[PDB]
Design a protein around this nucleic acid. Sequence first.
RNA 1: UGCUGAAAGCAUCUAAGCACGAAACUUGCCCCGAGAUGAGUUCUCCCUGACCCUUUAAGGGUCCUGAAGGAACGUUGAAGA
RNA 2: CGAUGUCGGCUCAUCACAUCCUGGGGCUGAAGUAGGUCCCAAGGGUAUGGCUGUUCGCCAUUUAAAGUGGUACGCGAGCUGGGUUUAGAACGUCGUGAGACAGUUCGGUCCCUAUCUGCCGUGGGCGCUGGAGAACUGAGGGGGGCUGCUCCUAGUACGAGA
RNA 3: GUGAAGAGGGAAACAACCCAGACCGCCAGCUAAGGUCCCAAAGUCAUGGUUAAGUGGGAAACGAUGUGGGAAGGCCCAGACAGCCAGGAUGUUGGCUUAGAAGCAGCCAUCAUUUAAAGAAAGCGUAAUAGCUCACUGGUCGAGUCGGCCUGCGCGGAAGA
Lengths: 209, 122, 176, 38
Amino acid sequence: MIGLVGKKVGMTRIFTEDGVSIPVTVIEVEANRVTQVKDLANDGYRAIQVTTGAKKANRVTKPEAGHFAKAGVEAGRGLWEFRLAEGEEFTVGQSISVELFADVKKVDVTGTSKGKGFAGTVKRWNFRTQDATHGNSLSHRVPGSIGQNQTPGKVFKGKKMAGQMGNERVTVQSLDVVRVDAERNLLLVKGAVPGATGSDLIVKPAVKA
Amino acid sequence: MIQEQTMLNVADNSGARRVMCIKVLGGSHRRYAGVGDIIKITIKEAIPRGKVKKGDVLKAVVVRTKKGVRRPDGSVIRFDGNACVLLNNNSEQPIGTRIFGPVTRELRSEKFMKIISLAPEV
Amino acid sequence: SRVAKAPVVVPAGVDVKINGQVITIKGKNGELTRTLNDAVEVKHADNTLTFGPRDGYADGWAQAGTARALLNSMVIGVTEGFTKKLQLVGVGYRAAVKGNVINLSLGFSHPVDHQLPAGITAECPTQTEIVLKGADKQVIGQVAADLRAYRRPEPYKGKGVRYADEVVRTKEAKKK
Amino acid sequence: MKVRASVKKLCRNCKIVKRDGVIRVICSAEPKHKQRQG
RNA sequence: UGCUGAAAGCAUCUAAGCACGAAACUUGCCCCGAGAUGAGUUCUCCCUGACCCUUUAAGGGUCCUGAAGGAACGUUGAAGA
RNA sequence: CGAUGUCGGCUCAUCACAUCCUGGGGCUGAAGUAGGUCCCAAGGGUAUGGCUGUUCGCCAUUUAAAGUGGUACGCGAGCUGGGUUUAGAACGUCGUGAGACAGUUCGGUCCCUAUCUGCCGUGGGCGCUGGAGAACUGAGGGGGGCUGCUCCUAGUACGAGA
RNA sequence: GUGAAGAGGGAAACAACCCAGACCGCCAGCUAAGGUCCCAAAGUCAUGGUUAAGUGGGAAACGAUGUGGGAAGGCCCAGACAGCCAGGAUGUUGGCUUAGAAGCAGCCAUCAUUUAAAGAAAGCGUAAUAGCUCACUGGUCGAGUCGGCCUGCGCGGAAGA
């Protein structure tokens, strides 16, 4: 089934009547407007493309402005589309609310993780550091050996080395949905989700049922 | 957070006063023992008249930790020292007759009934 | 070869249709359709069935021999059918059946359900004996084998599911 | 199941069979005479 | 491990045919991915004025127009050498 | 021999299967739990300490297991320098002696700013053909794949009992 | 003999293996070893056989109703081989080493009746017994069947970074 696009809004905890406190991530899921519906006849697959939020009138380009005007949908920030499960249908211009998550229990949240920049092997791949004393010289956090000898004669592809860490989309799956608030457009999910505050997130029902 | 080579006090009156943890049981490559995990210890100094002598290896259960324990609502319990209770290596069965100091309720595993009963508090 | 050189008499009231190499036989139970090997030719041979190996196949005689056995099996099945009897040995063993599903309890923590295929009927005259009937011999043998595989007989008490007409070897602990 | 390289008719009730290019010995009296590689 | 089954009247898991059968294999889960030069698909937006020249060609030169959009610059960022 | 640094340790690994564990099976002198042996299986996993420079090994306590090998007995332009293997000194022994001893002790400089291949990241150029802004399909590639204990079934099947 | 001190063609690459000894030029022809489906020049050429294994295109002792051919031999419509309802008994619980070996541990003979037909005993199984089979013998269908030798080509044996 289709997901929804929301914005991460900090974190909080919910106190239950029995005493236990549930850490919850707050996701602001306002109305999602369908801008385009894809069908097997034309696109070879069925999907719905949705938009959310708002954009400055002078900031949206003409190609994007015409695309929204065709669907009669107010311009929003970015576009995302979700594949259909063959059991439901949608129409252009339809608005989708967070209420569809009322009957679900597990969700999958996808977002861009925080960017750590160029990271070393110790931080990136949990490499073990070498001794800080006992004669060690300029080799306290160095990766160490990266190959065997002449017989391979090369470093194998996929070697773990320092490089860019974070700033890629990652998915946290099977997260418990704690509360849904349609009128206030909130979705409380137990746990933590990728990305920093204000980052766009995609929420869909858990697939590992 | 009890790991190998850690000093522990003895809550019971078995005659031991200070013990060394030499192994954390319950899993391969386990790092440190929790609130109520079984550990293997060696006695470093005990009462001469006690039933347990120095330099003997026997199991033990942690009852108090300096690091503390976490409650489901976010509360924590912390102590000024680490304490344990002695065992029999074949059946858990704390050999002590009385245990001093508070004991947390995390040990209620349908089994440590003897420990909790002897506990002056909780 | 030798078996192939032995036509099988078709009893009255049985319809045989030869569509190329496919054979359809109708008796009193149902229509049985079987595709035949390309290396064997069959003609109506009124009142009988005959099989001949076409030239150009080294194993032509063998394919004829197995073909003749298959045709006889279907002829018997449509005329009368095939029945197999299975016995359950062991305390607390039930073999209740209802509709098209067999319920068994072979000492497992959960019930065992078996979905019979089309054209197979199961009856339970007694709580431990189950009898299966059908129009062809291959399917009944397969179904009975599937039923037996659930709890193979073991050679200390002969428990589990066994065929009505088989002998199960038994052995005893020698010392311990 | 014996996986020896030499197969023989150990008893009278032993039959030589070829299955999937592998020569097997099947016995209907005692399983101890069943052997795979031939 | 089998069902049926001849060669070999029997038997036989196999030769024809039909069943099951493992953390292995393919998929299912997550991520990258059309430089996939085999460079894909869909949606939307913008440009529809004149002169001449020759070895008259998917040719060259001049005037007027240069849109969508992009870049640059600035303020910057939970993005970043 | 106009120079290929040769034992251990650390970091980082990768492959084979003659499999240590987990998975699927045959036979058993397999009652059950637990075993013995053989076949299929390399997806993942596959200890911490004391003594010694040690690999190994003995010992202590864990785990489902603490697998066997290849890779310059993997890896010093990645680290250490304990052993061995310069110059000092001493002991035992051999020699008249200088000295010698896979005999033993004390002490004893480990250089390199990366051109190319490779690998981990991240950009520019052009192409994909009128140009431009977006959203995708997905060929193909990679990551992940471990498992203990307790309870129910049941104290059931099995067993004279345990 | 070749290389060293010899190029050229062939064996994928490969001084020393096979063919063959380069004076120079030619967009001429015929051959050697080796080859002729495509990479890649030339037979998807002709005739008669073999192989089912990717054998060909690594490897042995040894194992096996794989398959082709040859020379024979025993039994066979006074009817064979495999199947099918049948029979397989009486002392020989033996004297013998009497502990029980009784055919199924051996000293031992290896007798004898009913007989269409049976042995003082071949297998499994009992402390020995018992018991179940096969040797052998009747009846139906009924035609070939059985065990060795010579070998052609194949299969297993056959696991490494």
